[PDB]
């Protein structure tokens, strides 16, 4: 019958106190005949009652997709409390239970370095500004670029790569006009990660 998938909140939502993180319990292959689903939610084995069901959606293979959403607290999440979804349905001999938590293990702090473009790059119209973020754990991170308090348009971040010491690294590349670089403009690399002080840090780069 139905299958259950449990999904974590977005990294930023857990890190920014001004945002609302949520775990999502997704039930697929719910039938046209027994469409009723009952969710039970537990936080470290203690039942909570604040979840809300999203509107039910019919798929093309004519099953329903049924979804319960639970608001979690930043620090509970960050402290690694366990969230359990219990799904009941008549097509189901017994209820299905899935459990989610933050990635297990001792967090490690992102070492963050800015790197100026190569001299050999000064030939081209555009130069590359490089932010190296390394030795972090877990891999939940956000990395953005800014100048004079404004987000920069043209940058790309590599996905996190697992190093052989068990931590992650990535690089973010900012592409700007040679002028802006050359005329002293200050650019900033911003990182969010649970293990940074205030989940934040900012490193700057200019000529």
């Amino acid at each position: 019958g139905p299958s259950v998938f449990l999904f974590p909140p977005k990294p930023k939502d857990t890190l920014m106190i001004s945002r609302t993180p949520e775990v999502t319990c997704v039930v697929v292959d719910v039938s046209h005949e027994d469409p009723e689903v009952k969710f039970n939610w537990y936080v470290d084995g203690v039942e909570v009652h604040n979840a809300k069901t999203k509107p039910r959606e019919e798929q093309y293979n004519s099953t329903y997709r049924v979804v319960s959403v639970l608001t979690v607290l930043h620090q509970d999440w960050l402290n690694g409390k366990e969230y359990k979804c219990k799904v009941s349905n008549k097509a189901l001999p017994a209820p299905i239970e899935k459990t989610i938590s933050k990635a297990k293990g001792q967090p490690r702090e992102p070492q963050v370095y800015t790197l100026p473009p190569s001299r050999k790059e000064m030939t081209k119209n555009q130069v590359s500004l490089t932010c190296l973020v390394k030795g972090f754990y877990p891999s939940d991170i956000a990395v953005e670029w800014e100048s004079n308090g404004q987000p920069e348009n043209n940058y790309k971040t590599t996905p996190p790569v697992l190093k052989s010491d068990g931590s992650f690294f990535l690089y973010s590349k900012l592409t700007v006009d040679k002028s802006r670089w050359q005329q002293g403009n200050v650019f900033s690399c911003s990182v969010m990660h649970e293990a940074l002080h205030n989940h934040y840090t900012q490193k700057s780069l200019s000529l």
Binding site: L15, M16, I17, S18, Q150, H197, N198, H199, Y200, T201
Partner: peptide
């Protein structure tokens, strides 16, 4: 000790 990100509040100790 508060960190802000583009005018948005991240975290205070």
């Amino acid at each position: 000790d508060c960190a802000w990100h583009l005018g948005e509040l991240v975290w205070c100790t």
